[PDB]
Amino acid sequence: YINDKGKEVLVLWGIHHPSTSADQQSLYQNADTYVFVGSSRYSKKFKPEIAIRP
Amino acid sequence: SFERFEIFPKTSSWPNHDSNKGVTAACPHAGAKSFYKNLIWLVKKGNSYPKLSKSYINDKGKEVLVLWGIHHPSTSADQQSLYQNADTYVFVGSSRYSKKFKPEIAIRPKVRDQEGRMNYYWTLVEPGDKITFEATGNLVVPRYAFAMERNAGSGIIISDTPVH
Amino acid sequence: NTQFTAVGKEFNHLEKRIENLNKKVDDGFLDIWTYNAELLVLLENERTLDYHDSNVKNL
Numbered sequence: 001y002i003n004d005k006g007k008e009v010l011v012l013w014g015i016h017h018p019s020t021s022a023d024q025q026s027l028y029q030n031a032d033t034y035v036f037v038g039s040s041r042y043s044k045k046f047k048p049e050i051a052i053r054p
Numbered sequence: 055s056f057e058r059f060e061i062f063p064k065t066s067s068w069p070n071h072d073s074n075k076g077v078t079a080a081c082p083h084a085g086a087k088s089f090y091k092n093l094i095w096l097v098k099k100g101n102s103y104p105k106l107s108k109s110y111i112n113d114k115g116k117e118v119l120v121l122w123g124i125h126h127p128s129t130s131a132d133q134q135s136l137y138q139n140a141d142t143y144v145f146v147g148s149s150r151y152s153k154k155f156k157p158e159i160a161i162r163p164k165v166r167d168q169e170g171r172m173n174y175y176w177t178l179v180e181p182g183d184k185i186t187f188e189a190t191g192n193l194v195v196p197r198y199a200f201a202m203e204r205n206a207g208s209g210i211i212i213s214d215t216p217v218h
Numbered sequence: 219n220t221q222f223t224a225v226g227k228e229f230n231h232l233e234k235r236i237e238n239l240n241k242k243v244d245d246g247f248l249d250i251w252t253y254n255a256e257l258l259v260l261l262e263n264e265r266t267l268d269y270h271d272s273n274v275k276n277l
Contacts, residue, residue: 049154053147054184209224 123194137191
């Protein structure tokens with residue numbers, strides 16, 4: 001997305017960490033995945049941490 | 055208030071790993087390799103280190119302060135000596151906390167004759183909260199924790215002045 | 219006034235900007251109290267010796 005709007009644009013997103021390998025595949029098939037948000041200033045590669053939390 | 059108790063007891067709760075080969079010279083006592091009293095350097099039973107998966111619920115009235123470590127070995131040579139599996143991870147989890155650790159294997163300038171390193175973490179499980187541990191090596195688990203009420207409003211004096 | 223305060227903070231080799239913010243908050247308060255502690259006693263000492271003067275002259 002290019003920001004053409006006059007002002008600055010606030011963008012939110014999420015990174016989903018699944019309980020188990022069982023549903024990592026139910027949800028996205030690939031077991032090893034990554035997300036990469038990029039931008040002129042920002043820039044981070046995320047990798048989902050698969051484990052069972054309370 | 056501050057009562058220190060033993061959650062993961064050096065006997066019962068560690069069936070499938072070595073509970074007392076976890077000892078280094080960096081931390082000598084009696085002029086003989088030892089370790090911390092509150093942590094416990096879990097190493098491989100025989101030629102094995104299964105997935106360990108210990109949980110604790112905080113039933114104590116107050117909040118409980120839990121510490122643990124993550125061990126980063128000098129080389130692949132001893133990553134295997136200690137935990138057999140070469141690729142490992144630790145995962146502390148909790149209602150609020152939650153982090154997956156992965157051991158960084160490299161040779162850092164000898165300190166206290168040590169080319170490996172150990173990172174220590176803490177976290178306050180509040181009453182009613184659970185907290186999961188889970189590992190495939192490289193975890194230094196708690197032996198003792200600390201239940202406590204903080205008026206968390208004060209400071210530290212660093213002085214050679216007497217206490218009266 | 220007098221709140222329970224525990225001046226004093228620890229930072230590490232990598233939170234030096236904060237440590238300097240904390241430094242100036244302190245120096246800031248020092249320069250303030252020192253100045254008022256001084257002019258206060260000064261001006262109050264002034265007035266007190268006039269009170270006494272004013273007092274005999276009334277007698």
